[PDB]
């Protein structure tokens, strides 16, 4: 019987193994047709994209059965949206996650190629400033493995995070064109471009209010798959790039309007009011939005109509997280949609709104939160100040009503600011318009509840929850330090990579005297390895037998590197006072980008060098002391030296990092921690045990005791000669012989402006530090107390922080069942 | 044994039937697999793409396999330089060159998609303006067919020449982001990327001219496959994209170097003295060049070493062909390489690139020649701009040796022309350094050769040659009109198709009945589709049994559209005097773009629509008559409209059209042709013969003695009533009531400053028209007339073009030849 096109179509099948001499073809077939190229002229480069064709076809499959799989159940969907996506290299991640890595090494191998060659020719996918970013991406990996149906949106920029160079000691930025020879792992989908409005002004009408005159610039999403561990689940990662809606000059301006996304902003824990900025902002959260409402509509299987028209069910079948406030506007942007265009009533439209929307707070730093001028948010987005405002009219009038008569109260929790400058606080809009606001770690979900939230605690106490911060274990550990993987999996199995707490068994192992030599031997590995990749691609020097001390994170005052250095100086200074005394060979290593307006963060990288340039060629020193800045701090260099590292610098200011997880990274991977009780840290100290860390400086209360009678960085270098002498070593140009004054804005910060008390936590840095030496001088009870670390890291998997995402807040329950292939 | 890296890679093989069943697989595999699609949610354009993507591959392994026999033969390669490649569409075209049309028609059926309606969702590759861009088209078709080694070379502009869209009888004109959906057919080179520089300045040094502080811009290679005609050959089109070689700024600035590939100028005979047209003319000189010696240098099979350092077989074994002067930087940057970078001396460096170079003119029209001022070359290429002048200088010396004392003959033939604004003629720069210098039609040859290039004739007559243009038989026959190819290969077999000279046999039927009404019933066929395409994707009307009247080609003063109008108002007006006399049927089209500075052709476009406003809605007129203005002509409607058509429009004044090419697919696909004795006109006349042509006006002569005595259109205005009455109707503003003036410029340049003399060529034209209307009444005799068209229309085919360019210019022999598969 002559079948009809639909009956024929039924032919268009998801077809066609996971076998070496299968992947040999494929990878053959893609280094031809796919790229087309040929043994003749066929580079690195090239094999490596016939691979990554090779493995992204797994990829796919997997994802087109995953995304099928959610509209035949019709799970309730979780949209991550976020400014930034730290997502690194995919190559690896993505064969150990589908178990291919072993199948494709031989396949590679019986064609002469040497896969691990291949990865490193992969670029990151440097869509981010540092953690923020990289927990999105941690994120992702986790809410797949869980078996989540996640969504990651966010901006594609064609241009990440400057690629950091150094020159003379200075930080020097390039531009990271790290789409030049081109992005496999995503997908254009120029079919699927929405309008994004800017400008213009409002109607009210009897029909409604009627945003008018805008100006239209399109967002074309680019789709790249994210698998989950063994469970062949593959969610979505959307990225928005913006596109165009005296004739040689028109088509030449056309250009101007895809700038929307052409640059990641390079700020880190600060706040930069530029419109561009805004307009990124908007651009990715009206173009989400359009995309989360037309996806719950068209839920039928096999059907792209609109059948489910009834908001009803939207809170359960949609979460939207902000990741900061960045994304803010998806709040009155929701409200818009639903009560402008769905014809939705106001009070219902913001039921379903609040229901939807959960924030995650992730500093408690002025310069860093979010505070839009009103002229600037009247100009780009009238209709939605408009809704912004009766926001906050609906919200304070229930202020009114729990605290009547408190007049200041109303100053204090209004989502509009007064001031110099008139402005809107994103946090109270976010946390107005979410059922659910979290912190990022214990010690800081508490202080938001105590200090800059506090009012808002007292009027809704139920919405504010703790998700302390978490790292994936397939990057951070299978993928980084497969060493160390592979000794834990020899004793315990391979569960823990997917149940991190499984890691607490290695406690009965911490006096097993091969276990104890493996693990130190793993380290050792990693610092040759790294000592070499160092050299190799830079000019190194390296005594791999030295204690790597070692803090990379974005360079802030916070962090505190300028603590870093005081002691480095301290201890050069200290070598060379008592020339005929040992000393615990060390190589100290700071590396970090800062953000190219960060003045003081910048002379901070060149105090790094400077210091190098005298150390490192001091005779009387000899390779007792090694420093060093470690050039363009990203995602795949993290991957490199934090599993060569033995101690962690995590020195940051009680109460100012929120979190942190390069410190969690750090547990993981083998190196003790010297760090204060701030942010994660103290969950860390709590699980391996105060004994088994480094802890040291002002506790949160003491910095606060020292703020209301006021900090005097001149009492401390009164009295502390050894301080007294770094400084003045800073001052008078003893790191800077050609420039005396080079030095002069630190060292005067320092001793008169310092809002993070460097000096009031010098003398007990020091002493710990000491400590910390004269533990390595054991080398058979350091490593205990590593193991002692590395056993008790099992909180820090991000699949428990999304675990508790997914139960605490979305109302989904995690899932490690697997679906077929 | 142990195979090393070397032996293993062996298998890396070009490897993986043109089966119903193999295609199926791979449409499925695609769909899926590339596109990230599945039939859930599969568009047209999806499963378009996923064919596109079928074919590619056998197009690839095709590709490569040639390109890896041109470095195992090393033949002399052949490449045609040209700002302009107006492609068309790829699909139908791969197809039926790899004979994969039947396979696939019979795969896209079982899976229940029509491959027609697939194929209209392609978009065309119009990156050119008119004839120039199209032969270049054809010419790369023809030169894979007969197994040339042959390239093109041009720009990859994001942006073709302008959808012409009509609102108001008006030409609109909209960007051409003919890369919306991508191009499956290019392939990216990221990784061969070139430098090309410009402003700086020039040091005269003891080791050589350095031509230093230049700024740059770099040239990104995107490869396009191009398939010959059944025999496994496929050639390259290479076209070069522009990239970057405060500081949010400087990232979004970087994108504005790459403005240089973003748009194709629009203007077509029109020489446009901008910088930007001229940093594009140097920035495809630059790259090709380099790459071109660079694939001469590394000549060995499977070794990519540059073993060929010496130059001596250069011109053996390369060829440019500059396509119009809009590349003739090639000559100077050719030197500048050989002299400046390898060192070679003056003399011997200047023989090879004559022997290397060829110049194809393509107008003889003043304000269409090329003519760049010196200050502009002289800021943008200094270094250029010298060996311009040295150049000049030698060849001025040889000048004077041949003609001793003829002072005002210096003047006359020098690269620098005074004047209002120094310039340098880059026609002179071209002859000055090629060894051929073709016309592209007998007339037009012939006319250089006695008019503007007469003084170089003199000097060097060996380098003058004629190679009279022609089209592929396989995209103007086979694809566009299957049913006359069909109806055709019915008797003759299917040789013509590469073999346009077999068309004479089908003379030995011009008295075959069958065939007789074969042939008429394509047309009709033709004529129906095409009524109906029209009225489907637009709003038209059709009494598909009228005389189609067509006129397709830009709009120009000297290709008179003007003179077809003033007959369709001539027609009109005498259908309303005597409503009681017969009328054979016309259905008028013209259609064509105009530049967007053109102010006059724009006019035109606006006098087509103004008329047939009035025309097509007078009912004393009835569908006698119908004008039409055909919106956004291009290669995929020219390849719909010209098959449906009955009469042919050349009516260029004589001497100004140098060839022409719409009118050979005219002839090709049984139209009549009315037209003057002008450009390929006249060898189509003699091919066919006059009695089966519509020959009118004045002939080269005629025009010439006018000019000497001064054109006076006054004299045929006050002794033709009939055109008094037209004109009237024009100023008076019978045909804008709205607007009175409206036609106002048309008429006082059509009566005061025609340079095309119009009205010179009015009666006769008028009296020619009727001689075509009568013999339509006569079908018969109408179609045994075509026959005698198409059946003479073989020495129009490109391959005859070529094959000519091939055997007296370049050095290399046709090849029918195939390779295997
Ligand atoms: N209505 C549907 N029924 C079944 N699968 C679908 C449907 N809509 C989309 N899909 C699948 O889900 C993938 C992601 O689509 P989207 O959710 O629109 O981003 C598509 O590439 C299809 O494979
Ligand atoms: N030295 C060579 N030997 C054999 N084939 C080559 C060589 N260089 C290039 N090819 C082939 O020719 C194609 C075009 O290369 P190219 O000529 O550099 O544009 C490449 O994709 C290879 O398939
Ligand atoms: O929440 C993820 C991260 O966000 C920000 O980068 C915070 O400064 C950091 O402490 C936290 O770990
Ligand atoms: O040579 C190709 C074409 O070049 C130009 O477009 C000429 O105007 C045209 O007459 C010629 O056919
Ligand atoms: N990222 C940043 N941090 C602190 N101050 C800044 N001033 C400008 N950019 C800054
Ligand atoms: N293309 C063109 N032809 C004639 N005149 C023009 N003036 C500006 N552009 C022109």
């Known amino acids: 019987r002559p079948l009809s096109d639909q009956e024929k179509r039924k032919q268009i099948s998801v077809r066609g193994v996971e076998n070496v001499t299968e992947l040999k073809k494929n990878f053959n077939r893609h280094l031809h047709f796919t ?7 066929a580079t690195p480069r090239d094999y490596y994209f016939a691979l990554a064709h090779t493995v992204r076809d797994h990829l796919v499959g997997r994802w087109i059965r995953t995304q099928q799989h959610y509209y035949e159940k019709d799970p309730k969907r979780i949209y991550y949206l976020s400014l930034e996506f730290y997502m690194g290299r995919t190559l690896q991640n993505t064969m150990v996650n589908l178990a291919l890595e072993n199948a494709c090494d031989e396949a590679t191998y019986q064609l002469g190629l040497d896969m691990e060659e291949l990865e490193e020719i992969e670029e990151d996918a440097g869509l981010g400033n540092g953690g923020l970013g990289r927990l999105a991406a941690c994120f992702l990996d986790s809410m797949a493995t869980l078996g989540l149906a996640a969504y990651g949106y966010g901006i594609r920029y064609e241009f990440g995070i400057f690629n950091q160079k150094i020159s003379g000691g200075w930080q020097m930025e390039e531009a990271d064109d790290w789409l030049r020879y ?8 120029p079919e699927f471009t929405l309008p994004v409005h800017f400008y213009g002004h409002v109607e009210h009408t009897s029909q409604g209010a009627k945003w008018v005159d805008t100006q239209v610039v399109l967002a074309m999403p680019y789709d790249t798959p994210v698998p989950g561990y063994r469970n062949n689940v593959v969610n979505t990662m959307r990225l928005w790039s913006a596109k165009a809606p005296g004739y040689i000059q028109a088509v030449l301006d056309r250009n101007l309007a895809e700038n929307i ?15 561009l900025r805004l307009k990124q902002e908007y651009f990715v959260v009206a173009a989400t939005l359009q995309d989360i409402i037309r996806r719950f509509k068209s839920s039928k299987f096999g059907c792209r109509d609109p059948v489910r028209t009834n908001f009803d069910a939207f809170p359960d079948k949609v979460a939207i997280q902000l990741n900061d406030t960045h994304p803010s506007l998806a709040i009155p942007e929701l409200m818009r949609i639903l009560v402008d265009l769905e014809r939705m009533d106001w009070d219902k439209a913001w039921d379903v709104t609040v229901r939807t929307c959960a924030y995650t707070n992730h500093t408690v730093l002025p310069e860093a939160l979010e505070r839009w001028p009103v002229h600037l948010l009247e100009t780009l987005l009238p209709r939605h100040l408009q809704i912004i405002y009766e926001i906050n009219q609906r919200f304070l009038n229930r202020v009114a009503a729990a605290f009547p008569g408190d007049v200041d109260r109303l100053r204090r929790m209004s989502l509009v600011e007064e001031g110099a400058v008139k402005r809107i606080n994103m946090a109270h809009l976010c946390i107005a318009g979410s059922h659910a606001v979290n912190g990022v770690a214990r010690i800081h979900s508490e202080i938001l509840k105590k200090t800059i939230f506090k009012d808002f605690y007292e009027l809704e106490p139920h919405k504010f929850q703790n998700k302390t911060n978490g790292i994936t274990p397939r990057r951070w550990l299978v993928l980084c330090n497969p060493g160390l993987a592979e000794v834990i999996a020899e004793r315990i199995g391979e569960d823990f990579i997917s149940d991190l707490d499984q890691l607490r068994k290695l406690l009965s192992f911490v006096d097993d005297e091969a276990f104890i030599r493996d693990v130190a031997k793993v380290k050792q590995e990693n610092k040759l390895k790294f000592a070499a990749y160092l050299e190799r691609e830079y000019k190194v020097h390296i005594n791999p037998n030295s204690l790597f001390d ?4 974005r360079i802030h005052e916070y962090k505190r590197q300028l603590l870093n250095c005081l002691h480095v100086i301290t201890l050069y200074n200290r070598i060379k006072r ?3 005394k040992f000393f615990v060979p060390r ?5 970090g980008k800062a953000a190219p307006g960060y003045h003081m963060a910048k002379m901070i990288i060149r105090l790094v060098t400077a210091i190098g340039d005298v150390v490192n060629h001091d005779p009387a020193v000899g390779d007792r002391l090694r420093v060093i800045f470690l050039e363009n701090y990203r995602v795949s260099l993290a991957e490199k030296v934090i599993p060569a590292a033995d101690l962690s610098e995590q020195i940051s200011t009680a109460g100012t990092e929120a979190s942190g997880t390069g410190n969690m990274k750090f547990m993981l991977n083998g190196a003790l921690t010297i760090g204060t009780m701030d942010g994660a840290n103290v969950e860390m100290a709590e699980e391996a045990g105060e004994e088994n860390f480094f802890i040291f400086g002002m506790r949160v209360e003491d910095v606060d005791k020292l703020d209301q009678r006021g900090y005097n960085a001149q009492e401390y270098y009164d009295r502390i000669p050894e301080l007294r002498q770094v400084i003045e070593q800073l001052s008078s140009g003893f790191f800077s012989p050609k420039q005396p004054d080079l030095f002069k804005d630190i060292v005067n910060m320092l001793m008169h ?5 460097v000096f009031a936590d010098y003398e007990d840095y020091i002493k710990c530090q000491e400590k910390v030496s004269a533990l390595y001088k054991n080398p058979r009870e350091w490593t205990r107390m590593v193991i002692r670390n590395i056993a008790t890291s099992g909180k820090f998997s991000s699949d428990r922080t999304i675990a508790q995402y997914a139960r605490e807040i979305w109302g989904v329950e995690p899932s490690r069942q697997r679906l077929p292939a």
Chains 1, 2 share one sequence.
Do not use: C
């Open 261 to 275: 996304s052409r640059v990641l902003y390079p700020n880190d824990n600060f706040f930069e009011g530029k419109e």
């Open 578 to 580: 008592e020339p005929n």
């Open 182 to 189: 081109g992005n496999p792992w995503e997908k254009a989908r």
């Open 587 to 591: 190589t100290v290593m700071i590396g």
């Open 753 to 757: 402006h310092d809002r993070f008390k």
């Open 550 to 553: 070692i803090q990379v994170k």
């Open 35 to 41: 790229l087309v190229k040929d043994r003749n002229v």
